[model samples]
Target: AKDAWEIPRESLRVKLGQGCGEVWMGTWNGTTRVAIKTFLQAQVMKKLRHEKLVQLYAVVSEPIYIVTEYMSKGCLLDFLKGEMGKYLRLPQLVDMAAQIASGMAYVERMNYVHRDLRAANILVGENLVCKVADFFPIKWTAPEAALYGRFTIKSDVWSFGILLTELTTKGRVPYPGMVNREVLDQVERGYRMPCPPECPESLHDLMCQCWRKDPEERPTFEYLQAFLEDYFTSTEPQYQPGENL
Candidate 1:
């Protein structure tokens, strides 16, 4: 159970994101600002928290409000699609990717699955660190999830691989020029997208592994987290998001 906190609807400052819910920036105690997620699942998400994941602070009914830490930069997909994304260096990308994988690893450990794990579902925090968002839904149509409408950790692993492609391409549409049906067919046929501009070969290999047909063959978030941690730690000329190019 969560405490009931009443925040005036007028307190909402700005809208941040939308998908599983509509996220808004709201001020609490007339001073501190927070991100508020408006959705029915707010109750469930309010109970879960990890550093790399958005912090759910308060939950309210009557109008339905789920409060969390305000992420100024909004979603990573929109950020990467913008002009400034061009300034993102390799190290910066790796750092963000590592943070995302780390967040998912925590979710993985909890035995929960994020049915929709995409760049759009990732939020950029104060320092450009990626926080996995929109993770409450289990209404996916995967192998197991399709017939039974369930989701598994391996399904999230597959989504992470697609996310890697998005980050590498700076938010290009996945499976360009192909409809959903065709894309699905191609995927079943072992078709994978080529590497994006300047993406590291090792990173590409990791993405490929994530896309393997057999879910068992896909690497766990633990492996991805360790891999990225090693890569980010070894890389030089560190860069944080929204900083000088």
Candidate 2:
């Protein structure tokens, strides 16, 4: 929150984010660059955890400003649609998702639930490095929350499942032209989402596990991370080691 008085919107050219509240702007001074994301909805973007999530640099007191490192590639949602997405291969997608799961695993250890995880919430920067962002919709609950309210670790699993499905389909809609209820119905009735653009069935199955209805049955993020990592390491010459290959 900035000063309670009239908040001075930074003179830097503000970069609007796809989701409301998330923004990227160049400060007028150029001496400092900032990424300000104001999380609306009921979710709070604070509670920093893993490296896979965006790092918080600072905050304003008034209207509220979340400052972080500026990313050049913008949102993963955008990256998947433009040139950056074209360069992404199955392994790359798997590896990127692995990063997400690893981070989520760390958060799960702390009993924090990522209620809403998706490609749109992830930001990709140079070198294909991706970090989870826009945690505005996360319900921020744990086992204790379940006792008071209905929030639980399973909630994180649910969101991660949706993210896994989104990742496999290359951002394709799970329910083609379906609304919320329809999407829910289809997904509930074994409507498995598509695979990563040209991704293999084995990989696709992994995502299915993440999005399982029985939250208790869903594999932990740690498990998901290990599974993807094993695949990546299985092939000796999986990737050409170099400067951002």
Candidate 3:
């Protein structure tokens, strides 16, 4: 079978970053610059297509190369912790959250649960557009998912709340000063992190809603998308970068 996504390995170029696997800055057909990741999830990735979700371009099965759009700004976690963090305003933060929610909404619509959703798994591109990247750790995993292996969209929603805190605090680790076991215990006992500094009360409330004991009580990604979009464009004046910092 001739797959449209098949690409030649010789086209790949420049080693970019390395962690869980190797990533290369490459060109697709000598025209489009792309990020080549050495992974093997083509079946699931190829089916998902959305602007907010990192786009998978082509694949090389021999050594298992998964090509995706090159996000110039790298991971949201790193971006938020760097010089760019100083330039982010409230509206821009909300926009990033909205973009993540929009992508998650599409994922939910496709009936696929993103087992891992966190700030580290989000990529920032030109114009600061955020796209949900593929991949996770136990810290971002929901209690139910970690406990009973019950992964679902609602679980991802719970992780989104943690990611929201990451955005507001400029990539501060969730449950700072607490270990993974402590976090699980506290959350199970109905405790949640206090509102991060500079986070609006309403947004904090939304985060609380996402942490509800019952998954059924949490808002759908669709609702989150609309709510954040509305909040982003509301009467609140946009803050100038570093104006409040």
Compute each candidate's TM-score over C-alphas.
Answer: 0.83, 0.75, 0.93
- Candidate 3 accuracy as TM-score: 0.93
Q: How accurate is candidate 1 locally (lDDT)?
A: 0.74
Q: Encode model 1's per-residue lDDT on 102-126: one tens digit a residue.
A: 9999998887877888888898966
Each prediction's whole-model lDDT (CA): 0.74, 0.63, 0.86
Error of 1 at 38 (Å): 3.8
lDDT of 2 by residue, 45-139 (tens): 45564788777665555466656777778877777767655456657777888888887887778777665577777888778788977653322
- For model 2, the run of ten residues with the poorest summed lDDT: 138-147
lDDT of 2: 0.63
lDDT over C-alpha atoms for residue 214 of model 1: 74
Better of 1 and 3 by TM-score: 3
How far is 53's C-alpha from truth in model 1 (Å)?
Answer: 0.4
Q: Candidate 1: where are CA atoms >4 Å away?
A: 1-13, 16-21, 39-41, 136-150, 232-245
Q: Give the TM-score of candidate 2.
A: 0.75
lDDT, residue 227, candidate 2: 81
Cα RMSD (angstroms) for every candidate in the order listed: 4.5, 5.9, 2.1
